[PDB]
Amino acid sequence: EHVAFGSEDIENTLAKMDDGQLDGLAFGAIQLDGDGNILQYNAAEGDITGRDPKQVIGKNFFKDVAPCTDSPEFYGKFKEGVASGNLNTMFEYTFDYQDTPTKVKVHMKKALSGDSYWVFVKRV
Ligand SMILES: *C(=O)/C=C/c1ccc(O)cc1
């Protein structure tokens, strides 16, 4: 899939993409509901993080899968955006729960229709 990380229309291009289409992206992509439950999780993310994309669907990202992101700097920004109904933030972060610390760039952006939210990830 020919889509770049951080592109200004990314929510339109990814919108309603099925699981197989998402696996073709060059960067990690997760779709969360407003509570942080995982709706979609692509192959590129599983390769970065080691998690199995099939097993994490339905788990809570902030409680279960990613406690290192349960902080003001990640989860706090997510819940603020869910509450306001808009979200578009990009920052660097370190994942250090199930592996050696790994630095990434994260882009969280509200998905175009409904009340769903994207978390995009690439290595830095
Ligand atoms: C810290 O606990 C981060 C964990 C994590 C980040 C991203 C993922 O896709 C899965 C786990």
Curated annotation (Swiss-Prot):
**Keywords noted in UniProt:** Chromophore, Photoreceptor protein, Receptor, Sensory transduction
Transcription: present as a keyword of the record?
Answer: no
Q: Which PROSITE patterns match?
A: PAS
SUPFAM superfamilies recorded for this chain? PYP-like sensor domain (PAS domain) (SSF55785)
The UniProt function text for this chain reads:
Photoactive blue light protein. Probably functions as a photoreceptor for a negative phototaxis response.
Q: How does it assemble?
A: Monomer.
The similarity annotation says:
Belongs to the photoactive yellow protein family.
Q: How is this protein named in the record?
A: Photoactive yellow protein
Taxonomic lineage: Bacteria, Pseudomonadati, Pseudomonadota, Gammaproteobacteria, Chromatiales
The encoding gene is pyp
